[PDB]
With several copies, the nearest count.
Chain A
Amino acid sequence: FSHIPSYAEYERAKSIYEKVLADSKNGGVTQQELAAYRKAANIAKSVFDRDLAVQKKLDSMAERAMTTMYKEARVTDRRAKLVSSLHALLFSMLKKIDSEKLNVLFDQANSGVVPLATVPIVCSNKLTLVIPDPETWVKCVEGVHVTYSTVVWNIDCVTDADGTELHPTSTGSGLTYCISGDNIAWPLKVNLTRN
């Protein structure tokens, strides 16, 4: 409250008025000068109040600017972090593209364009197969080799819903997977692999 310079002038006016109103009592009331002192003190108080109000109103601008600059700094920091994370993700997912297969897939394309749906069908080497019922396992698995479309696949593992692993049972003709028991929780997620 006393920081503003006008407070010092207001205090000086207060002191001057207090001293003069007591020093002038020798000549009596002397309303002529008492009114002048009253008016001077009134003007001083009004000016002090106006200056104080103006300064108080102007104060908030500094806080607003500080908040704005702090927010700008935080948003740019977050942008930098996000850009780094996106770059890392892109360069991590781009690291496992075998250029050899990509060099032959686009050789047969109609002017170097191939629909996206047929990239994994011609480039991949593992087919994740899901079987929800014995009525489908009998009609699809066909022993140990699964034939989908035209190619012939093998089997690497068989995992059930619980997360455990089934194992083959050797027989005279060859390995087989035991199905239709009451202790296996469907579906069975089979991980194949190209021949």
Chain B
Amino acid sequence: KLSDVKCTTVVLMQLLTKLNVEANSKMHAYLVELHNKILASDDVGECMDNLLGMLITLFCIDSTIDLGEYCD
């Protein structure tokens, strides 16, 4: 189950980079910190919280229309 988070975080970071988050020199550093902490950890308890923190930023950058599809 840990590998699932460690593999979802990389694709999430790829999506955020494709969304042109590198323009901000403050948000990018915080996101990189979260991503590195998720990758370098072992306890899924911390990885899940850090992944949720990363995901909170996704809505702010771009209100993805697909937000209503994952529910079902």
A and B touch in the complex (CB under 8 A): yes
Cβ contacts B41-63/A at 8 Å (1 or 0 each): 00000001001110111011101
> For B55, what are the chain A residues with a Cβ–Cβ distance below 8 Å?
102, 105
A38 within 8 A of B: no
State the CA gap A122–B32 with chains docked (Å): 12
CB interface residues, A 96-112, toward B, < 8 Å: 96-97, 99, 101-102, 105-107, 109-110
Could you list 8 further interchain pairs (A-B, Cβ under 8 angstroms) beyond the known A97-B5, A101-B52?
A87-B66, A90-B11, A102-B55, A120-B26, A121-B27, A121-B30, A121-B60, A149-B56
Q: Report the interface size class on chain A.
A: 35 or more
- Residues of B near A83 (CB, < 8 A) are 15, 18
**Are A122 and B8 neighbours in the complex by a CB distance under 8 Å?**
no
Docked pose: A90 CA to B69 CA in angstroms: 12
Nearest B residue to A160, CB-CB: B25
B30 close to A123 (CB less than 8 A): yes
A106-B70, A114-B59 as given contacts; A87 in contact with B15, CB under 8 Å = yes
Interface size class of B (residues with CB under 8 A): 20 to 34
Report yes or no: B12 in contact with A90, Cβ–Cβ below 8 A.
Answer: yes
How far apart are the CA atoms of A122 and B12 in the complex, in Å?
Answer: 18
Closest to A99 in B: B48
**Which residues between 3 and 35 of chain B lie within 8 Å of chain A, taking CB atoms?**
4-5, 7-8, 11-12, 14-15, 18, 23-27, 30
Contacts of A114 in B (CB 8 A): 59-60, 63
Judged by a CB distance under 8 angstroms, whether B71 is at the interface is yes
| A1 in contact (CB, < 8 A) | no
- Pick the residue among B4, B69, B71 that contacts A97 (CB under 8 A): B4
Q: Which of A91, A105, A122 contacts B30 (CB 8 A)?
A: A122
CB pair A93 B63 closer than 8 Å: no
Check A89 against B11 for contact (C-beta < 8 Å).
Answer: yes
A90 to B11, CA, bound (A): 6
- A residues in contact with B67, CB < 8 Å: 106, 109-110
Partner of B8, one of A97, A106, A160: A97
